[PDB]
UniProtKB/Swiss-Prot annotation:
Belongs to the ClpA/ClpB family. Residues 80-142 are annotated as: Repeat 2. This is ATP-dependent Clp protease ATP-binding subunit ClpA. Component of the ClpAP complex composed of six ClpA subunits assembled into a hexameric ring in the presence of ATP, and fourteen ClpP subunits arranged in two heptameric rings. Binds to ClpS. The chain holds residues 1 to 142 of 758 of the full protein. Residues 1-142 form the Clp R domain. Coiled coil: none annotated. ATP-dependent specificity component of the ClpAP protease. It directs the protease to specific substrates. It has unfoldase activity. The primary function of the ClpA-ClpP complex appears to be the degradation of unfolded or abnormal proteins. Residues 2-65 are annotated as: Repeat 1.
Amino acid sequence: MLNQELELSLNMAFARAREHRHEFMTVEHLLLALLSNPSAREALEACSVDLVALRQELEAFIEQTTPVLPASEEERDTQPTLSFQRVLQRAVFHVQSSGRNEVTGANVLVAIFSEQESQAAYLLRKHEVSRLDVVNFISHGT
């Protein structure tokens, strides 16, 4: 049960990747998409996170590391990687658990912290985004 705003973020992520002809989408692409998601953004702002700085470093890492489909054929569409899928499944089933019906961008943001070795998680720690703070804000919100 993905809420309207999360569905949009995810569609925008796919749209962005297709535009850039990126061969795959990782959890980094996901976090980038979420910086514009109302639910996730509100949670980051509550933590006084510099979203401008975070987005720029995130956009840079994606460009320098994601393969661009050669002018050739085949593939056409981008494919979500295991990190992208795991995070989504984690959020979905965590929400399923005694809680609400809708999955929000904030729920997805929390699930990203579980991808410990990801550059996405590395960047959140770098910019001082505490998972403890994100969780408390969400628990007392919807």
